[PDB]
Amino acid sequence: RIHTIKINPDKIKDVIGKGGSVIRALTEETGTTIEIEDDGTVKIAATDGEKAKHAIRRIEEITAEIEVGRVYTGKVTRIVDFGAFVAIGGGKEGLVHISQIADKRVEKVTDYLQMGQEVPVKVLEVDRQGRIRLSIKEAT
Amino acid sequence: VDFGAFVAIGGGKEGLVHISQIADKRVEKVTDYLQMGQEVPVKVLEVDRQGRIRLSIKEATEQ
Amino acid sequence: VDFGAFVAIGGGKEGLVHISQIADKRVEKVTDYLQMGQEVPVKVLEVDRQGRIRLSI
Amino acid sequence: DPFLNALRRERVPVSIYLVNGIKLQGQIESFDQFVILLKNTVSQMVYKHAISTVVPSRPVSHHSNNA
Amino acid sequence: SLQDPFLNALRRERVPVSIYLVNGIKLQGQIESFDQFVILLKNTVSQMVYKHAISTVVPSRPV
Amino acid sequence: SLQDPFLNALRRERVPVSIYLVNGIKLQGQIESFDQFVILLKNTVSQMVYKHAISTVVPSRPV
Amino acid sequence: LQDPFLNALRRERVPVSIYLVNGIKLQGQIESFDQFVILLKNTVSQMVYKHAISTVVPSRPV
Amino acid sequence: QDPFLNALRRERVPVSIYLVNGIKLQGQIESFDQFVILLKNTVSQMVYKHAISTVVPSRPV
Amino acid sequence: QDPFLNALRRERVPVSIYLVNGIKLQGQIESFDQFVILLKNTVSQMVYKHAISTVVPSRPV
RNA sequence: AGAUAAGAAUAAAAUCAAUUUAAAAAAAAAAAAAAAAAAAUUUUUUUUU
């Protein structure tokens, strides 16, 4: 197959990554060859249909899909006082320090430390810089 | 476009230029001509952030 | 050169030490460091930093 | 301050940060002990009591004297 | 004292300005009086915009 | 300083004003005592307010 | 003026609610006063800077 | 009022230092000046008195 | 405090600068005044002292 | 590419990557002065405009 998607130009730097690390990771995790035109559209050079579908799923999980809006149920993943790294999607950790988690009455992170625990989360910091950060609804 | 323009010296592909280095800060507007399809020739200025492209209004190998 | 010297501690490349390091005093002229091949003290002594040397006479 | 006058003399493009963390890109055009004027795209005045830090994009020539 | 004459020139021309506060809030209007620590600016009525609370000023037109 | 007379005019007309603090708070009251560093309110809650913390003022009625 | 008003509060030993520029609230009683500092005998002795204060209000009329 | 900082330094009292941003630090005075305070706890550091909102001790002095 | 700052500048000590905001900066003193710092970084940088909350050195002066 | 035209008030609880962006990448000591300024001992000085 040489499958193709006419996907949005602006996400380019995030589909390549610094050092090409995330494109290298994508190609190796899908076991499939990829072109993502700097100006133009993605091409997927695949041996067979299921491997092409696997590549589509992974690049769709990092193209568009902006996480700005209402509460989403993110998986806590790593939990520490300096932050829960709560991920709503792949390659998107909502690093949420105790200062984001809590104000007034405050408590040791053991009170809610878990990995993969789905919990309610929405935007609290935003920029062009890709340092956009979400927070647990306890921030209210 | 007001927030940066695509200008081709030649070929179908259209290269980028921005409000300052289009016209070496002679104006606040992106283009002194401020007109699409306008005849003023274009060539590259050296400055190149890896995430930026520069194609200034330049004739006769001004450099 | 007048502006500074390239000084070898090992095999991995080492850039120009600026004449303002090489010479403490106001003058900063090549006469202070014109001798080729001379063995000299050299400590970068620098972390979280780009490649530089604090050699000083 | 002579440092700010030297920047004005060399007309170096600088990144200024505010106390709130807002980042302004522009070339400083005038300065008093209360304020800077920078005329990047339109004439703008910034108060020094609201500035946190300033860093130049190009290198800036050493004062070459005792502080 | 660069600020005082610039503010007087804005007051003389009664040019619309955008003032920003230290907290990042915008206000809009015309300067029509000032003093060493305060500005009186009209959008509904001429009113106090304290200079120590101002972060930035940018006019609609050159003055 | 023309700021003190403006505050005295509000006090003379006993005008209820909305005072905005730099932290992004509206307070409400009537202008009462006034010093180079601080302003008091003659409202039922007798507030004393630091002018370094005052951002902007708007009245109930033009002064 | 602020300095005499502060002395009057100290003279009448009035409990006040102090507000800080950060949006801090506190309640306390006066220990002493200074051109740059406010000292409170409520709980442990607190040295509160005038540059940090936004607003002061009494609990009882001064 | 003025020797309050000296009294804390004399009693070497661990004192809660509050910055305008709402951050709390902990430690004792090493030396103090009209514009700046140098702290004794852990590594010695300078905190601008201008940046300090309030100070409250672990014991009264 | 003035000599401590001169000693940091003399010894080219790496210091952590904290502003009123939660930013952390690494540098060394290039020059200092009661209103400003000039700081060694990737480039020479200006800091207004009214923006600084605290400075803490990596090594004592 | 713009920062809420102000949350009646955070007993007080440091946010990730401040040179950017696609496979790095370009790379850079001349420094004591002990307060800045004015009155002529004071004051303001980024400890209340």
Swiss-Prot record, chain A:
Coiled coil region boundaries: none
Annotated KH domain residues: 1-59
Origin superkingdom: Bacteria
Domain S1 motif: 69-137
Result of knocking out the encoding gene: Decreased growth.
Record's subcellular location: Cytoplasm
Inducing factors: Expression is negatively autoregulated at the translational level via an RNase III-dependent mechanism. Induced by cold shock (42 to 15 degrees Celsius) (at protein level). At low temperature, the destabilizing effect of PNPase on its own mRNA is less efficient, leading to a decrease in repression and an increase in the expression level.
Function: Involved in mRNA degradation. Catalyzes the phosphorolysis of single-stranded polyribonucleotides processively in the 3'- to 5'-direction. Also involved, along with RNase II, in tRNA processing. RNases II and R contribute to rRNA degradation during starvation, while RNase R and PNPase are the major contributors to quality control of rRNA during steady state growth. Contributes to degradation of some small RNAs (sRNA).
This protein's domain notes: The S1 motif domain is important for trimerization and RNA-binding.
Family listed: Belongs to the polyribonucleotide nucleotidyltransferase family.
Record note on quaternary structure: Component of the RNA degradosome, which is a multiprotein complex involved in RNA processing and mRNA degradation. Interacts with RNase E (rne). Homotrimer. The homotrimer forms a ring-like structure with a central channel, where RNA molecules can bind. RNA molecules bind between neighboring subunits. Might interact with YicC.
Name of the protein this chain belongs to: Polyribonucleotide nucleotidyltransferase
Originating species: Escherichia coli (strain K12)
Gene: pnp
Curated annotation (Swiss-Prot), chain G:
Superkingdom of origin: Bacteria
Family of the protein in this entry: Belongs to the Hfq family.
Shown residues within the full chain: 7 to 68 of 102
Function: RNA chaperone that binds small regulatory RNA (sRNAs) and mRNAs to facilitate mRNA translational regulation in response to envelope stress, environmental stress and changes in metabolite concentrations. Also binds with high specificity to tRNAs.
Keyword hit for Cell division: no
Keywords, alphabetical: RNA-binding, Stress response
Gene Ontology cellular component terms for the protein in this record: cytosol
GO biological process, one term: regulation of DNA-templated transcription
Stated name of the protein: RNA-binding protein Hfq
Disulfide bonds: none
Presence of keyword Electron transport: no
Origin species: Escherichia coli O1:K1 / APEC
Subunit-structure text: Homohexamer.
One GO molecular-function entry: RNA binding
Domain Sm: start-end pairs: 3-62
